[PDB]
Design a protein around this nucleic acid. Structure first.
Ligand code: SAM
Ligand code: ZN
Ligand code: ZN
Ligand code: ZN
Lengths: 86, 98, 222, 97, 110, 103, 82, 109, 95
DNA sequence: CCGGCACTGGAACAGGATGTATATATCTGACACGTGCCTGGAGACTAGGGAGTAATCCCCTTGGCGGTTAAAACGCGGGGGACAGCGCGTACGTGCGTTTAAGCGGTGCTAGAGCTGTCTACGACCAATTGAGCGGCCTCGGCACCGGGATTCTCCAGGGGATCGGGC
DNA sequence: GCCCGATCCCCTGGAGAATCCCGGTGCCGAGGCCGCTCAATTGGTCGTAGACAGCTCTAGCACCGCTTAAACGCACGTACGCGCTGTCCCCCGCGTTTTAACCGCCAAGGGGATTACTCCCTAGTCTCCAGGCACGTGTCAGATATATACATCCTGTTCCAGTGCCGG
């Protein structure tokens, strides 16, 4: 049962990682309160998709999550993705 | 006197360096440890394919990069050049998420 | 000059005479507020009352504040005080006995309802005998208030370019009425007076014999 | 007269469920159309999602196990928790009696 | 036939037609075969969602001293419920209107 | 000779806050029917000539047009307030439509 | 018999009413010619699809179901007309 | 089977499989019956739509002096044409990137 | 074991060699064109289905396929594709 | 009081250091061809029902007229709000030095996904028969308006009385 | 000093009012009541889809060690939010007069919507055979790595306009 629980893993999205994502979007100057809000915006998007992927995985009576469960879960919300099968 | 470039130059010249590349801009191990921790709430003792975690990072980065482009127009509307935590909420509210 | 002016038939409300009726509506076209049983004064004088801000009178059966709501001042009639004192050459005027605050309900303006044509034939009649009528007030289209034959003590007022009250228009139970409110608080002992914008069809035949700095003007200019 | 053909709706079951919750109110002739559209519009989502769940898995039958997953994908958080109980009890009361 | 007939709504305990849901499933191009407890499960879910809306619409019509539901009470019922509003987000209801709401920076200040 | 008095008029912004309260409570349609019905018949004359309409098909377009406009005028307001104003200008409709997706 | 001038039958008071039901307090003077251009690109997108659905069925009358289908195709469902 | 077998997609002058489009239409729960000129019509449209997203990417590759096509040229080809940008408007393409674009108020005066 | 996986690779590669004779393509891009074709096939099929249902018919024909294209494709694409199809169907019959 | 030995910001302009683009060399790993074989497509009949075509019936979309009243257009005025110019001070950007985990080579272990083979219970198909549900036709009957007698309250009234200035 | 015919604060025969209340007339919508037909229940026969029970063998999880690229503090000074004050012009609340939407009629005819009869086009079985998939293999395009050669940003050092305020 090598399942030692994980904790406090959202602070692994460091602030340089966020400054690069903002540079690719065209931003010149950044405030100092943005780093604690980008994380809350991301942790709400990831759950809506992992929920549906696990729901698709249980219906087939499997234990491994595959790369088609994620594609179906994404397409169900209007976010089609080309490149990973289908 | 070590030549001290002025504020706003080094930023403007990597805005256009990161708009010619196509790589991924987050660390793989820190991103993979968070996916396995969010999904301990819905069912325990799961296993992930190697390429099912590479499909989530792309959707995530494509979501954030396009939220920042909407945030950058509200600031110019209000006649600023910096982005604040009140320009994200207007974009999300007008899009129709919150 | 110890005499008393021609008496007037004292009255409490307006009595219709002309060709227009009243617009008492049913209790489904009356607006509702947003207050509730709460701190000391509901619908008070210093409060965020949506019915008060927009110049509405609230009903005791529809107001959620219940029956202790302070937005009922056209029925309770807590009017002003001591009656006519003698002026010098103005007609009769009035005066206050009790101290009054800033922005408080002074007495209403009340009379009889006459329309355009009846009013104009009335003035064309009373002109040929030189009565010098001094009592007219329009409120909206096809309606006039008159206080000549009958009325109340608010018929004894004057005009000044430094007044203390104005005539606003409140909507009471589906109908619109007139009420005089004080600009600023004053200790008792002053003659109440308010500005009115005349619209004489003839010409201005009176100077402002009141006395102030800018008050020279006329009875029809600014 | 040509004796025009018949046309079906849920307007006698919608009017039977109302007499259980509010035994005294009535409903209007134009408020009945909206409930018709509501029922016909929620039928199709739940049918069309199970139609695809069965095709991803290479089956050719729709059972009472695809309808329990279409509901868990389509309805929100606390709504999708009483519907499952309703539907699970109405099959136990039927397969035995 | 030899015995007396009983419906299939009567066996399950429902008010909706379990026999009419079945032929709509069979004649709609959804699959090649259809089980036996699929309509019995899909009717008990369409009845719950109807009761859920009609209760709130009646509670909202009561507060006008009215005894009859009209299309305004259906809108007021669903725009106030945080989950029916998420289920019916992109839907227009004819003759419904809007919800009263004024912003705080527009109210008059002294 | 004899004049008429006149009570003070309303301060600006009161007869515009009474209508915000009156129109957010009715349900009727806010456009005139013959004016709206001639526009629909001249727009459709560029796709196919000499066609007819149903009285309940012309009444279904007017219910969706107003639901579109009333819901765009609510996004314009929040941009106007973001910029610290009270007035809505023609450059707030464009920002609303661009963030929303239609342009 | 061709038509024209018909876009100016959507007057200025009819736009101020639609703004009051939305909740606005002041209105600039250039909004009125800006709204008649937005209302006229939404109606064409729907009437084109309605006329296509009508011509597929060999009719000459536009019914009330053509409009409902052409609206549902764009994610604007409408209850109460069929 | 006396005569020599002549494929159905050579009778029409196409390159996509008219014989397999039919099997996919029949096993896909779309209707009860399927006509005979339906696959000959659908293959001729699937073939035209794909011979124009490639003619733009082949042009975009020649600007880097390259010989092959990669996921970046398909993105540069799709987001620069306002018809394919209207058809593929809610699609993400893996390893594609963005377009070079920078507002004017941010440039140094 | 290793049963079979079908795709469109060998027809996409035949179409490429008519617009660009001296050009190739890689795997990451073949795997994007494949998803493209599979995605458009299923938007055009699932609307002819609904049209036939609305009109109370049992058969899908080229007259349904032609109308499902004008509702899906925008602008000039819908005018060039409609002319592409009605030449293949005209050549096929006369043979 | 404007001109004057010598005075002060303003303007320009090369000229460094740093960052960005070249021209060869080397070199690995994946793209583009061939070969053998199995399964899915094509050729030739045959039997039944879905759709094309003609015909009749009546509903409902279009067109013109008169008339009454509520909404749209036009012109005055006056106070409030949008837009610009200053000034102060707090927070974000640029660079340098020190610390901490991501990443790249392996290695070994086992869990679980995919394929193969029997075998029984479940859904489609068909026939005979009865009641659940839709269309058309009466009743009652809870509301909106009009009398009406008309009940608490008001009020116009010339009069019932305590007062007075002289009357006596 | 007593007292007389007027003389002003109460006072009630009517009368009148408004409108609490109780009750006549008249309605557009909804609720129940019989004929009627077609769609759902009962009862059997049968053959394919799905449920267990092995059995091979790929790939996802766990550990170890090292080299270096990225994250983390820390300090300085500079441009950029944010508040304040003054001004002027455009959008709101009023009255008048002009225009056309709404409502009630009546008239004529296109086209939607059933119902019947007869081909002709799609499904369903056998055969036969060739196009497309997996496996194996070689060579060349694109990815680094050097070295040199410029473009690009920031400032010190000169140089005209106008002259600091002195002054006869
Ligand atoms: C308003 S009427 C009232 C009747 C009576 N004179 C009174 O004061 O009670 C007063 C008349 O006196 C005139 N008046 C009142 N106050 C005045 C003033 N302050 N200056 C000039 N005339 C005045 C007005 O012209 C008006 O006609
Ligand atoms: Zn209040
Ligand atoms: Zn109150
Ligand atoms: Zn004066």
């Amino acid at each position: 049962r090598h399942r030692k629980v994980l904790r406090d893993n959202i602070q692994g999205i460091t602030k340089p990682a966020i400054r690069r994502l903002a540079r690719r979007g065209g931003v010149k100057r950044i405030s100092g309160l943005i780093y604690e809000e980008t994380r809350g915006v991301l942790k709400v998007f990831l759950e809506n998709v992992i929920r549906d992927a696990v729901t698709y995985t249980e219906h087939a009576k499997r234990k491994t999550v595959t790369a088609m469960d994620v594609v179906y879960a994404l397409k169900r919300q209007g976010r089609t993705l080309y490149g990973f099968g289908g | 006197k070590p030549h001290r470039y002025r504020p706003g130059t080094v930023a403007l010249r990597e805005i256009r360096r990161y708009q010619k590349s196509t790589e991924l801009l987050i660390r793989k191990l820190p991103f993979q440890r968070l996916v396995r921790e969010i999904a301990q709430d819905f069912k325990t003792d799961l296993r992930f394919q190697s390429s099912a975690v590479l499909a989530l990072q792309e959707a995530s980065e494509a979501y954030l990069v396009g939220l920042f482009e909407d945030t950058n127009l509200c600031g110019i509307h209000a006649k600023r050049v910096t982005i604040l935590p009140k320009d994200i909420q207007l974009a999300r509210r007008i899009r129709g998420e919150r | 000059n110890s005499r008393k002016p021609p008496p007037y038939k004292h009255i409490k409300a307006n009595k219709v005479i002309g060709k227009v009726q009243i617009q008492v509506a049913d209790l489904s076209e009356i607006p509702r507020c947003n207050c509730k049983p709460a701190d000391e004064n509901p619908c008070g004088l210093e409060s965020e009352c949506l019915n008060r801000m927009l110049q509405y009178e609230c009903h005791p059966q529809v107001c959620p504040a219940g029956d202790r709501c302070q937005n009922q001042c056209f029925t309770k009639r807590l009017y002003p005080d001591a009656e006519i004192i003698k002026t010098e050459r103005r007609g009769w005027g009035l005066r206050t006995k009790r101290s009054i605050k800033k922005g408080e309900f002074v007495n209403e303006y009340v009379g009889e309802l006459i329309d355009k044509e009846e009013c104009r034939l009335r003035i064309k009649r009373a002109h040929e005998n030189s009565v010098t009528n001094f009592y007219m007030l329009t409120v909206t289209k096809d309606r006039i208030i008159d206080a000549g034959p009958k009325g109340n003590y608010s018929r004894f007022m004057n005009h000044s370019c430094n007044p203390n009250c104005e005539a606003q228009k409140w909507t009471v139970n589906g109908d619109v009425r007139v009420g005089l409110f004080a600009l600023c608080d004053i200790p008792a002992g002053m003659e109440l007076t308010f500005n009115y914008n005349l619209d004489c069809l003839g010409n201005g035949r009176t100077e402002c014999h009141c006395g102030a700095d800018n008050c020279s003007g006329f009875l029809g200019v600014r | 007269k040509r004796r025009k053909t018949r046309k079906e709706s849920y307007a006698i079951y919608v009017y039977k469920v109302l007499k259980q919750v509010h035994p005294d109110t009535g409903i209007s002739s134009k408020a009945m159309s909206i409930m018709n559209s509501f029922v016909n519009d929620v039928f199709e989502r739940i049918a069309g999602e199970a139609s695809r769940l069965a095709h991803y898995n290479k089956r050719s039958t729709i059972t009472s196990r695809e309808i329990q997953t279409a509901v868990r994908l389509l309805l929100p958080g606390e709504l999708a928790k009483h519907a499952v109980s309703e539907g699970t009890k109405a099959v136990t009361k039927y397969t035995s009696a | 036939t030899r015995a007396k007939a009983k419906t299939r709504s009567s066996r399950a305990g429902l008010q909706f037609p379990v026999g009419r849901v079945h032929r709509l499933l069979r004649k709609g191009n959804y699959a090649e075969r259809v089980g036996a407890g699929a309509p019995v499960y899909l009717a008990a879910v369409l009845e719950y969602l109807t009761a859920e809306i009609l209760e709130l619409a009646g509670n909202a019509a009561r507060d006008n001293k009215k005894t009859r539901i009209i299309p305004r009470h259906l809108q007021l019922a669903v725009r106030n419920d945080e989950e029916l509003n998420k289920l019916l987000g992109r839907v227009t209801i004819a003759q419904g209107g809007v919800l009263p709401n004024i912003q705080s920076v527009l109210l008059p200040k002294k």
